[PDB]
RNA sequence: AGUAAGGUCAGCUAAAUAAGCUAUCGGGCCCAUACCCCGAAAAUGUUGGUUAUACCCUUCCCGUACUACCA
RNA sequence: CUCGCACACGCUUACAUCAGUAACUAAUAAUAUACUGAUAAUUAACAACCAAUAAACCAAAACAACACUAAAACGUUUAUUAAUUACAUUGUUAACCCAACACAGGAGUGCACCAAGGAAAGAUUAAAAGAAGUAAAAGGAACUCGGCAAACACAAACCCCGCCUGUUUACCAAAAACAUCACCUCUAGCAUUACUAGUAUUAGAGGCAAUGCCUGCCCAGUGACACCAGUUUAACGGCCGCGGUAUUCUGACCGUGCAAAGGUAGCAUAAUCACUUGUUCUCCAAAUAAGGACUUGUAUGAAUGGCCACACGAGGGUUUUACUGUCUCUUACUUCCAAUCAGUGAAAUUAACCUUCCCGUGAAGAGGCGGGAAUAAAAAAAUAAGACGAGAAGACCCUAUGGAGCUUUAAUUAACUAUUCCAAAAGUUAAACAACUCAACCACAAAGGGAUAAAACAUAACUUAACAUGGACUAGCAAUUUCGGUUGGGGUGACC
RNA sequence: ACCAAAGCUAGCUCAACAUACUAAACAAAUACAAAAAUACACCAAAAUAAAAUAAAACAUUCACCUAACAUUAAAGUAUAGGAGAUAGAAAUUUUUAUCCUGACGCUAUAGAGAUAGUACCGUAAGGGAAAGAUGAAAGAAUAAAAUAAAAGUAAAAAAAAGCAAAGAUUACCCCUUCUACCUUUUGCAUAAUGGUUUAACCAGAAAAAAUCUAACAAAGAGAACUUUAGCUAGAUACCCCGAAACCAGACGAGCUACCCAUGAGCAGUUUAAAAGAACCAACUCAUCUAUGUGGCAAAAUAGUGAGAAGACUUGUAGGUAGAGGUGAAAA
């Protein structure tokens, strides 16, 4: 029997929304991804990925917002921060040292010389300095942030040529993107998420991971330390 | 749908094999209806269109057994009714163009009673026949009044 | 028990065109020895059959090797 | 003597009043919650049924003051609408349900452990054997595979394998197996149903098992990647002979050969082929046990992990102390069985039996044949030598041109997923380059003699997102079918 | 003398003719969890049948096996086949209407499963029975007639000795002589197999060549063919029960494995602790031994044990279905 996905909400709201676990079962009802299920109940926060979003289209100019509080989000491995400006509030991903009572500037005006890089400001890649650490990379203009959102992951801008910016992803793979895409300066919060130690098998079950199967599989040819050259740069710029 | 032999050798394995036609997306223009239809057509259909020297000719010349499509039969029925009715709605502003279009297909003209049943299936025809024959029952008051009037006139003419 | 399988200079290897290295013997170089240079000698485990022999087969002998399981 | 009242779920009149039971139901009788006939009954306040849209709202339940990590069920108010009209419909019994039974089994929540609910013995006798309970002289493991069981005991220490809590073969194995924190390898740059409303500190496909000290050498082969050379073993896997040499022994060393490298550290007669009860010491009066050493283990060995340790264990082995009928060696007394009497009354089994012993014979172990012995007929209670006892058309073994599961280097080879090429389809562009003057004209710039062609291709060349057809290539997954015979039983060797 | 015995109807089978083919009943309620009068919708779908088998194996192949429009012949011919098993046409021919339809078919272990798809066994798809006897009148039950004949018992327990009987005998035994019966084997009283006994039911089937009898005969046969004594017709023939399996389509996650929803439990004691800590109940698993072994129980009872604030137990309800689901791999 076909099931219904819980992602039915249409209007954005800062308050936590109800969430139903899947357990690896697809809409049909069969297991597709193993080792998922039986976790602690969680609520989902509506995260606004697009940093640049004016309240009204009457004034498309840059706007500045204020940070209210930094909370812990069970879904993602990072920490989200509540940000309010004008007549609306938004949940956005907090950088390394974002705290309460702080002001964050969002802008898109690509200036010729430069703009000073602050720890929370979001600016287009065309105005940022060459040596800037960035996160929440927008792959295409207006598409929204998709890359570099995990805890402690930060990409570094490399160069800007013929009106096009090239960045380095955390996987040490170069990515080419138009300079007008919005990006956030800094490193994602909760830096020591990698150094966290799980004390017992039960803590894995609390997170929601079921134990692996006990079948003993002999290793094939895929195993072994593989040394492979770095793949070529991935470019999203459509050359006419 | 059928089977085949691997390597085309009789003494080889017998294998189920399905051959599918290659389908293409094209939009076609019909002069009778002056409308463009985006129809999934095959390369054989386009060759038959060129062979008949016209899209309207292809529909109006190929019989039902050659077409094998309910859309084609409805398309023929729509154009066949257009010719028989001689609708002035084809081009309200160009009466000269109207005469030219129907002049070329003058050999396919069929009477009205024949042009509205060419594209109907068995189920569609029965519904159409019932709709034409759908008559409310005549009240017995009307039947009895006519019976009484006949007797009264019969008695009147008997004196 | 059965099966497998090998013997070659003093020693170890490669070829059956019985060679190469080392050891052994003689000489040179040095104060002497060794290194080094020069020269010489040296063998196909055993019996029989393989045109005739050898690499082959057979007999004798030494030694090597695997397996010996279900109740 | 103590699982009692009520709700939910389930069952469906089996409940109540009166009457009858010769017989049917209760495994018996009385008798009637349980069998038969007639009549009657559960009354809603509790429970079911019991509005929609838009907007504001980041702030946990644990006496919640305030905090922790695993980040948490539990809504109010404002606005716009909502038939407005006593009495609607439905569940209300029970000793009950699921297990073939009126079955010692299975069964959720609230409140009590009682004020409520129930009867272990039908009547006798007091044999054996069997089950359950209590007590014991002297001895205290002398029993035995084992201290299993039992006990006035309820302690101490060593070793092996796993770190630990946890998990598994419902119905013969609860373990040393699996999982697990840790470490490591591998594959992926990303959007509307899984992974994920996530984005490499992320998520999958696996290995090995915390910690601590370590994880040596080897890309020849195979596999994978690169898809070319090549690169990879914390990928599958591998990690050596012969001869001589210090008085003797041993062999630092040397000669020679083959390899991709020749087993390094550690530990060790181990859960580790055989030799094996290796040898020695400690423990015991006595040691095929246990611990500690010696150690080529020519078949130990390093993430198919080696080694050491704390804690832990209904795992396996050993020792001391304390206890005891385990035992030397059994005994006494109770209850359920038992035997007699009264009621109801089953099962496997059964060719016909009037159903003895011995020796011999015999399809090779005779109640039945042969030669001899014994021999009034029946009943009740006991012990298990035989009836090749009863039970299951032997699980072992072989045969069957009888099946099936698993694996692959067996034979044949699709679909599907993924990779690559060609064709189809769609689109783009098109008319083309290596002199040099030797003479010599020309104010230049160039020129003339001594070459300045033809041709591009009869179309050509290239691109093509998403879908998608035909024909091939590679890989994954997977499909079909079989696995000869003779054999002093089969396999093995051999043979045809 | 009990238990029993006997009966002939209920209806059924195979055809023929034949209208032309989802009956009977539909007042109300019937696809909400069917039989519940009454609210803003979604609605719907197709992809060659495969294999058991035959070829004494099995891979190409294997009649009928969904859809033929028949009969007499051409003919089991041409052809198609690991050219093996077996498969097999057509051209061309033949066919006079209606009535004469009933039974060398069964009679309650037969005939349909049927008194009935009802009881009953299964969650479900599905499986699926046994069962009737008086007479003209029982408004002739102090009622009547009929066999008193299966195994099993009673009337009537037994008296040395033997495959239970035979030879006999004045006399039942006593005497003498005899190793049950089928199946299977070189050979069985064998301690090799099967049977308690009774009634009912249960297993040889085909006509090419041939032999026997007859008609007519160089010709026979009521067309189509065979013929150097042949042709036509008759008669004479070849079993039953049983696998593990294989393929296709349905129905099953109310037990169990795992997961998604929504709920509900963990008292006391020890510690700054709600720490996959510790002692011990409820609760959940099932270590060891003894009873039990057609048992209370198709896995339990008694004693003793491990966990008992978690990777924990548990109620309701939903999801994944056999080439699969699920799995802290025990196939
Ligand atoms: K987080
Ligand atoms: K009931
Ligand atoms: K012992
Ligand atoms: K356990
Ligand atoms: K390699
Ligand atoms: K030892
Ligand atoms: K244990
Ligand atoms: K006995
Ligand atoms: K023998
Ligand atoms: K037997
Ligand atoms: K037999
Ligand atoms: K028999
Ligand atoms: K279900
Ligand atoms: K029971
Ligand atoms: Mg998550
Ligand atoms: Mg893992
Ligand atoms: Mg594992
Ligand atoms: Mg019942
Ligand atoms: Mg009673
Ligand atoms: Mg009474
Ligand atoms: Mg009653
Ligand atoms: Mg009972
Ligand atoms: Mg009693
Ligand atoms: Mg009694
Ligand atoms: Mg006694
Ligand atoms: Mg005692
Ligand atoms: Mg004593
Ligand atoms: Mg002892
Ligand atoms: Mg003893
Ligand atoms: Mg033991
Ligand atoms: Mg004990
Ligand atoms: Mg040991
Ligand atoms: Mg353990
Ligand atoms: Mg250990
Ligand atoms: Mg445990
Ligand atoms: Mg078990
Ligand atoms: Mg269990
Ligand atoms: Mg057990
Ligand atoms: Mg490390
Ligand atoms: Mg380790
Ligand atoms: Mg393990
Ligand atoms: Mg291990
Ligand atoms: Mg290693
Ligand atoms: Mg290589
Ligand atoms: Mg040692
Ligand atoms: Mg050890
Ligand atoms: Mg050993
Ligand atoms: Mg022992
Ligand atoms: Mg001992
Ligand atoms: Mg030791
Ligand atoms: Mg080894
Ligand atoms: Mg390895
Ligand atoms: Mg090993
Ligand atoms: Mg520990
Ligand atoms: Mg222990
Ligand atoms: Mg002691
Ligand atoms: Mg009695
Ligand atoms: Mg007797
Ligand atoms: Mg005897
Ligand atoms: Mg005698
Ligand atoms: Mg005798
Ligand atoms: Mg008795
Ligand atoms: Mg007795
Ligand atoms: Mg006998
Ligand atoms: Mg016996
Ligand atoms: Mg027996
Ligand atoms: Mg048998
Ligand atoms: Mg076997
Ligand atoms: Mg055979
Ligand atoms: Mg076979
Ligand atoms: Mg078969
Ligand atoms: Mg199968
Ligand atoms: Mg192959
Ligand atoms: Mg294709
Ligand atoms: Mg086949
Ligand atoms: Mg064989
Ligand atoms: Mg054989
Ligand atoms: Mg033999
Ligand atoms: Mg062999
Ligand atoms: Mg066959
Ligand atoms: Mg056969
Ligand atoms: Mg077939
Ligand atoms: Mg051919
Ligand atoms: Mg009948
Ligand atoms: Mg009968
Ligand atoms: Mg009788
Ligand atoms: Mg006699
Ligand atoms: Mg005999
Ligand atoms: Mg025999
Ligand atoms: Mg015979
Ligand atoms: Mg017998
Ligand atoms: Mg037999
Ligand atoms: Mg028998
Ligand atoms: Mg004949
Ligand atoms: Mg088959
Ligand atoms: Mg099937
Ligand atoms: Mg369930
Ligand atoms: Mg507590
Ligand atoms: Mg605990
Ligand atoms: Mg118990
Ligand atoms: Mg007990
Ligand atoms: Mg006791
Ligand atoms: Mg405990
Ligand atoms: Mg514990
Ligand atoms: Mg289903
Ligand atoms: Mg499977
Ligand atoms: Mg499990
Ligand atoms: Mg295993
Ligand atoms: Mg196994």
């Amino acid at each position: 029997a076909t099931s219904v996905s819980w992602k039915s909400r249409t209007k954005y709201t800062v308050m936590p929304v109800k969430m139903r676990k899947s357990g690896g079962r697809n809409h049909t009802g069969q297991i597709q991804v193993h080792g998922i299920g039986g976790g602690h109940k969680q609520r989902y926060r509506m995260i606004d990925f697009l940093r640049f979003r004016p309240e009204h289209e009457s004034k498309p100019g840059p706007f500045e917002e204020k940070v209210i509080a930094v909370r812990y989000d069970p879904c993602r491995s990072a920490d989200i921060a509540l940000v309010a400006g004008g007549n609306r509030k938004r949940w956005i991903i907090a950088t390394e040292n974002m705290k309460a009572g702080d002001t964050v500037l969002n802008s898109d005006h690509i200036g010729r010389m430069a703009v000073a890089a602050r720890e929370g400001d979001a600016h287009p890649l065309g105005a940022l300095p060459v040596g800037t650490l960035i996160n929440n990379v927008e792959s295409e203009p207006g598409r929204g942030a998709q890359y570099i959102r995990a805890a402690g992951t930060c990409g570094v801008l490399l160069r800007k040529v013929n009106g096009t910016a090239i960045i380095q992803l955390p996987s040490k793979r170069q990515m080419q993107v138009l300079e007008t895409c919005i990006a956030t300066v800094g490193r994602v919060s909760n830096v020591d998420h990698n150094k966290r130690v799980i004390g017992k098998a039960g803590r894995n079950r609390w997170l929601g991971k079921r134990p692996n199967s006990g079948l003993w599989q002999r290793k094939g040819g895929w195993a072994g330390r593989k040394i492979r050259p770095l793949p070529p740069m991935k470019s999203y710029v459509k050359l006419p | 749908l059928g089977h085949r032999y691997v390597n085309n050798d009789k003494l080889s394995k017998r294998v189920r094999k399905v051959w599918k036609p290659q389908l293409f997306q094209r939009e076609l223009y019909s002069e009778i209806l002056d409308k463009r239809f985006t129809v999934t057509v095959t390369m054989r259909t386009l060759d038959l269109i060129d062979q008949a020297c016209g899209f309207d000719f292809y529909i109006l010349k190929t019989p039902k057994e050659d077409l094998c499509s309910k859309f084609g039969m409805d398309l023929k029925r729509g154009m066949l009714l257009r010719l028989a009715r001689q609708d002035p709605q084809l081009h309200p502003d160009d009466p000269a163009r109207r005469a030219a279009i129907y002049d070329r297909y003058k050999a396919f003209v069929i009477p009205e009673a024949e042009a509205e049943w060419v594209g109907l299936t068995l189920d569609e025809a029965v519904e159409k026949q019932r709709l034409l024959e759908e008559k409310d029952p005549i009240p017995l008051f009307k039947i009895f009044v006519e019976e009484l009037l006949g007797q009264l006139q019969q008695q009147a003419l008997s004196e």
Side-chain angles (χ1 to χ4, degrees), chain A residues 4-239:
Chain A
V4 188
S5 178
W6 68 272
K7 318 170 186 178
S8 64
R9 174 165 292 271
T10 313
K11 179 181 181 178
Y12 188 91
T13 173
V14 297
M15 298 187 59
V17 198
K18 305 199 64 177
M19 173 182 174
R20 296 197 305 267
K21 292 183 173 300
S22 181
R25 274 73 176 179
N26 45 19
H27 65 265
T28 299
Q30 306 187 14
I31 280 187
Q32 189 165 1
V33 177
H34 301 71
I36 295 183
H40 188 283
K41 192 175 183 302
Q42 298 171 352
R43 282 187 298 185
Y44 174 78
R45 279 78 175 178
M46 307 279 292
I47 305 297
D48 191 8
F49 284 151
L50 185 56
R51 291 304 310 271
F52 186 82
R53 177 174 296 182
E55 291 81 2
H56 290 64
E57 60 94 12
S58 62
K59 38 182 179 180
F63 56 93
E64 208 176 7
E65 310 188 58
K66 182 176 184 176
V67 175
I68 303 176
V70 178
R71 306 302 180 182
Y72 173 77
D73 191 71
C75 298
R76 53 199 48 79
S77 53
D79 297 341
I80 61 184
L82 177 61
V83 166
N87 297 268
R88 54 150 163 78
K89 317 180 190 185
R90 296 161 57 187
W91 290 97
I92 66 176
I93 293 185
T95 66
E96 184 183 355
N97 284 332
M98 281 178 62
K99 63 179 179 301
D102 192 4
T103 307
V104 171
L105 171 62
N106 303 327
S107 181
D108 60 348
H109 175 248
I110 303 180
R112 42 176 295 180
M113 300 284 302
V115 291
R118 293 182 61 257
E119 198 68 23
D121 291 347
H123 288 109
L125 292 177
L128 296 177
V130 172
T132 304
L133 305 179
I134 53 182
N135 50 17
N136 290 262
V137 170
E138 192 174 333
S139 59
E140 295 181 352
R143 186 175 181 87
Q146 287 181 326
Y147 305 88
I148 315 184
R149 303 206 307 262
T153 62
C154 57
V156 45
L157 185 56
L158 295 184
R159 47 189 167 94
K160 302 178 300 180
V161 290
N162 59 88
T164 307
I166 297 181
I167 71 177
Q168 168 173 133
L169 297 179
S171 176
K172 298 186 59 179
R173 178 168 185 173
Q174 299 185 358
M175 165 183 168
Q176 178 172 274
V177 58
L178 291 175
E179 89 284 6
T180 175
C181 294
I182 314 299
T184 300
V185 182
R187 307 179 68 262
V188 191
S189 49
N190 195 12
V191 186
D192 287 3
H193 179 279
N194 187 21
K195 294 163 55 63
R196 176 193 52 177
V197 48
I198 293 176
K200 53 184 177 180
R203 184 162 283 96
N204 286 112
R205 300 299 296 265
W206 302 350
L207 267 301
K209 304 180 182 303
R210 299 204 297 102
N212 307 136
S213 183
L215 180 57
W216 182 83
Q217 302 184 23
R218 181 179 296 101
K219 299 172 178 173
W222 56 270
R225 199 272 296 268
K226 297 289 184 55
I227 293 297
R228 177 169 57 181
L230 188 68
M233 176 184 62
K234 183 70 62 179
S235 61
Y236 300 97
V237 178
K238 302 177 181 180
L239 298 177

Side-chain angles (χ1 to χ4, degrees), chain B residues 1-134:
Chain B
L1 304 180
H3 304 175
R4 86 171 200 273
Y5 290 164
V6 291
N7 305 124
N8 294 120
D9 191 5
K10 181 185 176 303
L11 300 173
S12 294
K13 193 79 60 179
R14 192 188 59 179
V15 154
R16 312 166 71 96
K17 182 58 181 177
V18 175
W19 287 284
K20 300 179 183 179
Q22 187 178 4
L23 306 176
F24 293 91
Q25 200 75 6
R26 302 294 187 268
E27 52 181 357
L28 305 175
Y29 189 86
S30 65
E31 302 175 356
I32 299 300
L33 303 181
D34 276 358
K35 195 178 182 180
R36 294 195 175 188
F37 305 94
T38 302
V39 177
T40 299
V41 300
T42 325
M43 291 307 297
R44 190 177 189 273
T45 300
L46 297 178
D47 295 337
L48 292 184
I49 287 182
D50 301 334
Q51 184 177 12
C53 299
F55 172 71
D56 295 323
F57 288 97
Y58 164 74
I59 304 296
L60 291 173
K61 186 177 63 178
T62 55
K64 176 182 181 301
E65 296 84 19
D66 204 335
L67 217 51
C68 288
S69 59
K70 187 183 66 178
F71 176 77
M73 292 281 93
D74 290 334
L75 191 49
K76 175 194 296 186
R77 177 166 55 99
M79 297 184 300
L80 208 62
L81 285 178
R82 181 64 70 91
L83 268 57
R85 296 168 65 93
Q86 196 68 25
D87 290 331
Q89 53 191 352
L90 174 55
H91 281 281
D93 304 333
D94 296 331
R97 293 253 304 277
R98 174 187 299 106
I101 296 298
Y102 298 112
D103 177 66
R104 292 191 297 266
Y105 310 98
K106 64 185 302 299
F108 304 103
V109 178
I110 228 185
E112 188 77 7
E114 302 271 357
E116 53 169 356
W117 300 74
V118 292
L120 295 190
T121 60
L122 181 58
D123 299 331
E124 294 180 329
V126 172
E127 167 70 14
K128 197 176 190 301
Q129 184 66 23
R130 183 203 62 84
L131 188 60
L132 296 180
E133 297 185 357
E134 187 179 14

